[PDB]
From a paper:
Certain monkeys have modified their TRIM5 genes by swapping the virus binding B30.2 domain with a cyclophilin A domain inserted into the TRIM5 locus by retrotransposition. This leads to expression of a TRIMCyp protein with antiviral activity against viruses, such as HIV-1, that recruit cyclophilins. Here we characterise the molecular details of Cyclophilin-Capsid interactions focusing on TRIMCyp proteins from Macaca Fascicularis. Using a structure/function approach we can show the molecular details of how adaptive changes in the TRIMCyp sequence switch specificity between members of different primate lentiviral lineages.
In a previous study comparison of the crystal structure of the N terminal capsid domain of HIV-2 with HIV-1 indicated that the HIV-2 CypA binding loop is shorter by a single alanine residue at the position equivalent to HIV-1 CA88. Furthermore, Mafa TRIMCyp2 restricted the HIV-2 mutant with an extra alanine, whereas the wild type virus remained unrestricted. HIV-2 can be made insensitive to these charge changes by introducing A88 into the capsid, resulting in susceptibility to Mafa TRIMCyp2. This suggests that the two viruses normally utilise different binding mechanisms but that insertion of A88 confers an HIV-1 like binding mode. To test this we solved the structure of HIV-2 with an alanine inserted at position 88. The introduction of A88 increases the structural dynamics of the HIV-2 CypA-binding loop and allows it to adopt alternative conformations. Importantly, this allows the main-chain nitrogen of the introduced A88 to adopt an orientation that in HIV-1 permits hydrogen bond interaction with cyclophilin residues G72 and H54.
Residue numbers in the entry:
A (entry chain A), B (entry chain B): 2 to 146
The structure:
């Protein structure tokens, strides 16, 4: 999550209580139907950095990471297909529009993620887009497990 | 739940995201299959006070609340019958053994609940015994809804 203190938006991590709650939620029936709303509530206000921490937390469930990974690449490829990258201009020292991999938090830092989410000039809610990609992945975990 | 810092055992509330997760879980299929797994998992480590915080969140489902009330009542009564307590509640100074409603958090404080759970000479798992009564209620709500 993110918090504003003196014209400065800053990262605050998910508390251990919450990460711990999510792990429990997941291990309870092993991707039971409950993980989907559970995840939507526990990831409210999150940056991609924070969602990747949530997933790292259950990473010993390799079979679900793989289902989730597959959809992330599926949705990130689609994203790139629907967000070309325009032929400049873009000024050295100025932050790129995000690609499907910046949204997933693979090629971007938490700080860049906060800059897209809260910039006044067409923010891009990268954390909320990513959550949509994970949800679909979670829904598949539930149907294939 | 309970944090152990400084040889003194202290209440740590459920994180707000945990509580919202509970609600989403409940309101997802209106007391659907998930609430029981969801309950078990998110209620881990709680005092009855916390279990009651969870319940106050979904308090506007009076119908399920009522089903839960019957159960707590059935169970709190059999607790009292199976722990006679002699004529006539003397008492003393040292904290009373829990009655059916100290377990339900009605006639007790979190400090008192933490006191039963952690005292070294015969602890009493009040949070968990109470979890057990809320699951039977929830199991009933799923059957009844």
């Amino acid at each position: 999550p993110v918090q504003h203190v003196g014209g400065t938006y800053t990262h605050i991590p998910l508390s251990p209580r919450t990460l711990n709650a999510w792990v429990k939620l997941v291990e309870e029936k092993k991707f039971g139907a409950e993980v989907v709303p559970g995840f939507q509530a526990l990831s409210e206000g999150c940056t991609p950095y924070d969602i990747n921490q949530m997933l790292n937390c259950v990473g010993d469930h390799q079979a679900a990471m793989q289902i989730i990974r597959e959809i992330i690449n599926e949705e990130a490829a689609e994203w790139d297909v629907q967000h070309p990258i325009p032929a400049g201009p873009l000024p050295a020292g100025q932050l790129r529009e995000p690609r499907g991999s910046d949204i997933a938090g693979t090629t971007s830092t938490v700080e860049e993620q906060i800059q897209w989410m809260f910039r006044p000039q067409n923010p891009v809610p990268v954390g909320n887009i990513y959550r949509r990609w994970i949800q679909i992945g979670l829904q598949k975990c539930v149907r294939m497990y």
